Write a protein that binds this ligand. Structure first.
Ligand code: SF4
Length: 206
């Protein structure tokens, strides 16, 4: 009776789950978005990564992490010696929440409410049950709070392996790559290195 739960089929098959998510009305976000954007990757993945939501580019590509933030993430993964093809990558909410500004060049993402996060969480549970990751990288506040609690602060736990969640994977909470796109150069460079560090922490979990 709550959120997305009745839309989630009784299967662990990612293709079947993704097709079912296309029909989800578990919160209001499906109305204005173009389509649901499920995770991408396969069930043998050892590392799962979770962002906030599909953004402007993802909403139309049908795939996660395809815009500028995704390209920065690619650069960090490559520096961390992680093959993106070996990951399962998804988002805490699966429809893009947005507005437009006059004269703008893109649709501007808006923050999912905690209510929407909890509504969509049945999909995330299904993904985690399906993939059985050894480690989950939580990219940004929304994703980190989705698994670690609404009071959790990413900024206060950088580099730490956390454990609370299906399968009891290790959890590593880090900054979202979109936050690394802008700011003064030295700050962006230090922040990029810290993202690489946290990805390496995740990859070194045994
Ligand atoms: S954001 Fe999640 S719960 Fe809300 S309609 Fe989309 S798939 Fe369903």
């Amino acid at each position: 009776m709550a959120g997305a739960q009745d839309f989630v089929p009784h299967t662990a098959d990612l293709a079947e789950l993704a097709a079912a998510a296309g029909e989800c009305r578990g919160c209001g976000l499906y109305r204005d978005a173009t389509q649901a954007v499920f995770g991408a990757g396969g069930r043998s993945a050892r590392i799962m990564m979770i962002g906030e939501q599909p953004g402007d580019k993802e909403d139309l590509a049908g795939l996660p992490f395809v815009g500028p933030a995704g390209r920065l993430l690619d650069r960090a993964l490559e520096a961390a010696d992680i093959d993106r093809d070996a990951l399962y990558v998804t988002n805490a909410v699966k429809h893009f929440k947005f507005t437009r500004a006059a004269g703008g060049k893109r649709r501007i993402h808006k923050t999912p409410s905690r209510t929407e996060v909890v509504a969509c969480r049945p999909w995330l549970i299904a993904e985690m049950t399906s993939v059985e990751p050894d480690v989950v990288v939580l990219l940004g506040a929304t994703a980190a709070k989705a698994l670690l609690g609404n009071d959790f602060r990413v900024t206060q736990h950088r580099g730490e392996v956390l454990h609370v969640v299906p399968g009891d994977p290790a959890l590593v909470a880090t900054v979202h790559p979109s936050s690394l796109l802008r700011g003064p150069k030295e700050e962006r460079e230090s922040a990029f290195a810290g993202l690489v560090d946290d990805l390496r922490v995740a990859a070194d979990v045994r």
